[PDB]
Write an enzyme that holds these catalytic residues in place. Structure first.
Site, PDB file in Angstrom:
ATOM      1  N   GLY A 261       0.828  -1.205   0.000  1.00  0.00           N
ATOM      2  CA  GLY A 261       0.000   0.000   0.000  1.00  0.00           C
ATOM      3  C   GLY A 261       0.866   1.259   0.000  1.00  0.00           C
ATOM      4  O   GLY A 261       2.003   1.259   0.494  1.00  0.00           O
TER       5      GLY A 261
ATOM      6  N   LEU B  89       5.966   1.888   4.535  1.00  0.00           N
ATOM      7  CA  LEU B  89       7.144   2.295   3.821  1.00  0.00           C
ATOM      8  C   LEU B  89       7.640   3.622   4.358  1.00  0.00           C
ATOM      9  O   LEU B  89       8.761   3.969   4.120  1.00  0.00           O
ATOM     10  CB  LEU B  89       6.869   2.371   2.297  1.00  0.00           C
ATOM     11  CG  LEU B  89       6.417   1.032   1.699  1.00  0.00           C
ATOM     12  CD1 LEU B  89       6.060   1.158   0.186  1.00  0.00           C
ATOM     13  CD2 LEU B  89       7.510  -0.047   1.909  1.00  0.00           C
TER      14      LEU B  89
ATOM     15  N   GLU C   4      -4.020   3.210   5.160  1.00  0.00           N
ATOM     16  CA  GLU C   4      -3.778   4.223   4.098  1.00  0.00           C
ATOM     17  C   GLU C   4      -4.654   5.460   4.204  1.00  0.00           C
ATOM     18  O   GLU C   4      -4.165   6.589   3.964  1.00  0.00           O
ATOM     19  CB  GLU C   4      -3.878   3.627   2.684  1.00  0.00           C
ATOM     20  CG  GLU C   4      -2.897   2.547   2.430  1.00  0.00           C
ATOM     21  CD  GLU C   4      -1.470   2.957   2.597  1.00  0.00           C
ATOM     22  OE1 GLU C   4      -1.152   4.142   2.347  1.00  0.00           O
ATOM     23  OE2 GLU C   4      -0.625   2.060   2.943  1.00  0.00           O
TER      24      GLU C   4
ATOM     25  N   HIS D 256      -2.968   7.886   6.601  1.00  0.00           N
ATOM     26  CA  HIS D 256      -1.988   8.802   5.919  1.00  0.00           C
ATOM     27  C   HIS D 256      -2.537  10.093   5.359  1.00  0.00           C
ATOM     28  O   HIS D 256      -1.905  11.178   5.466  1.00  0.00           O
ATOM     29  CB  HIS D 256      -1.271   8.094   4.760  1.00  0.00           C
ATOM     30  CG  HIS D 256      -0.233   7.136   5.214  1.00  0.00           C
ATOM     31  ND1 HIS D 256       0.882   7.550   5.919  1.00  0.00           N
ATOM     32  CD2 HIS D 256      -0.090   5.802   5.013  1.00  0.00           C
ATOM     33  CE1 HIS D 256       1.622   6.485   6.207  1.00  0.00           C
ATOM     34  NE2 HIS D 256       1.063   5.419   5.662  1.00  0.00           N
TER      35      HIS D 256
HETATM   36  O1  LIG Z   1       1.829   2.861   4.021  1.00  0.00           O
HETATM   37  C1  LIG Z   1       2.578   2.016   3.469  1.00  0.00           C
HETATM   38  O2  LIG Z   1       3.776   2.316   2.969  1.00  0.00           O
HETATM   39  C2  LIG Z   1       2.183   0.641   2.996  1.00  0.00           C
HETATM   40  C3  LIG Z   1       2.239  -0.607   3.859  1.00  0.00           C
HETATM   41  C4  LIG Z   1       0.864  -1.121   3.903  1.00  0.00           C
HETATM   42  C5  LIG Z   1       0.613  -2.049   5.088  1.00  0.00           C
HETATM   43  C6  LIG Z   1       1.452  -3.113   5.460  1.00  0.00           C
HETATM   44  C7  LIG Z   1       1.182  -3.931   6.540  1.00  0.00           C
HETATM   45  C8  LIG Z   1       0.041  -3.680   7.252  1.00  0.00           C
HETATM   46  C9  LIG Z   1      -0.814  -2.647   6.908  1.00  0.00           C
HETATM   47  C10 LIG Z   1      -0.529  -1.838   5.832  1.00  0.00           C
HETATM   48  C11 LIG Z   1       3.277  -1.579   3.429  1.00  0.00           C
HETATM   49  O3  LIG Z   1       3.374  -1.640   2.223  1.00  0.00           O
HETATM   50  S1  LIG Z   1       4.309  -2.626   4.233  1.00  0.00           S
HETATM   51  C12 LIG Z   1       4.616  -4.006   3.159  1.00  0.00           C
HETATM   52  C13 LIG Z   1       4.407  -5.388   3.728  1.00  0.00           C
HETATM   53  O4  LIG Z   1       4.314  -5.539   4.939  1.00  0.00           O
HETATM   54  C14 LIG Z   1       4.309  -6.567   2.773  1.00  0.00           C
HETATM   55  C15 LIG Z   1       4.920  -6.541   1.497  1.00  0.00           C
HETATM   56  C16 LIG Z   1       4.797  -7.643   0.630  1.00  0.00           C
HETATM   57  C17 LIG Z   1       4.076  -8.790   1.026  1.00  0.00           C
HETATM   58  C18 LIG Z   1       3.473  -8.827   2.293  1.00  0.00           C
HETATM   59  C19 LIG Z   1       3.591  -7.722   3.156  1.00  0.00           C
HETATM   60 ZN   LIG Z   2       1.842   3.578   5.761  1.00  0.00          ZN
END
Ligand SMILES: O=C(O)C[C@@H](Cc1ccccc1)C(=O)SCC(=O)c1ccccc1
Ligand SMILES: [Zn+2]
Length: 170
Positions: free
Chosen positions: A45, A92, A134, A137
């Site tokens: 995300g 991220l 999200e 944010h």
């Molecule tokens: O705001 C962000 O950058 C995005 C975030 C979204 C998210 C991750 C975990 C829980 C809630 C929301 C991330 O992209 S972290 C990426 C991650 O944990 C992941 C990546 C690839 C496969 C499985 C998990």
């Molecule tokens: Zn985030």
């Protein structure tokens, strides 16, 4: 090549995002840049706030295969219950930091897509967790805001170390 992702504690992550006026071709390009940025990290995300574009735009792909892209423009998210589910969240904008947050386990999402079409779906599981994260944010909130202030501080000190190492690797 890719869009720069702001890092906690950058004050610009606190900006409340403005709704998108029209789905122009420039917001279509921004979305596609966001997806590339997000897939590269990798993450699942990204909100436009995170790349310093303070508009109500979120890109998301919850698939293993990185081939189920979703866009949410001007989203409204409404809980359908007071039941929460715990989930270990990352971000991220808080690179390599993960902890548990309890959010409403079912939500209605209403938003528009990249063709300017409105839609309304109900979500649970990982979708409800990620859309709430999200949306946060978009209102200048990070998932670290729900942790104790010693988790926050440690997250901050750790992230500043990661960012410095990433500069050094350059
Ligand atoms: O705001 C962000 O950058 C995005 C975030 C979204 C998210 C991750 C975990 C829980 C809630 C929301 C991330 O992209 S972290 C990426 C991650 O944990 C992941 C990546 C690839 C496969 C499985 C998990
Ligand atoms: Zn985030």
């Amino acid at each position: 090549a890719l869009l720069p992702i702001l890092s906690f504690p950058d004050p610009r992550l606190r900006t409340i995002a403005k709704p998108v006026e029209e789905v122009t071709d420039e917001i279509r390009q921004l979305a596609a840049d966001m997806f590339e940025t997000m897939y590269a990290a990798p993450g699942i995300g990204l909100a436009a706030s995170q790349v310093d574009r303070h508009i109500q735009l979120i890109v998301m792909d919850l698939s293993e295969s990185k081939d189920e892209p979703m866009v949410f423009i001007n989203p409204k998210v409404t809980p359908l219950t007071e039941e929460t589910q715990p989930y270990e969240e990352g971000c991220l904008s808080v690179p390599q930091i993960y902890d548990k947050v309890d959010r409403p386990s079912r939500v209605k999402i209403e938003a528009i897509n990249l063709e300017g079409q409105a839609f309304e779906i109900e979500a649970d599981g990982l979708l409800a967790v990620c859309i709430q994260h999200e949306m946060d944010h978009l209102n200048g909130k990070l998932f670290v805001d729900y942790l104790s202030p010693l988790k926050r501080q440690r997250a901050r000190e750790k992230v500043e170390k990661i960012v410095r190492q990433r500069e050094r690797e350059k």
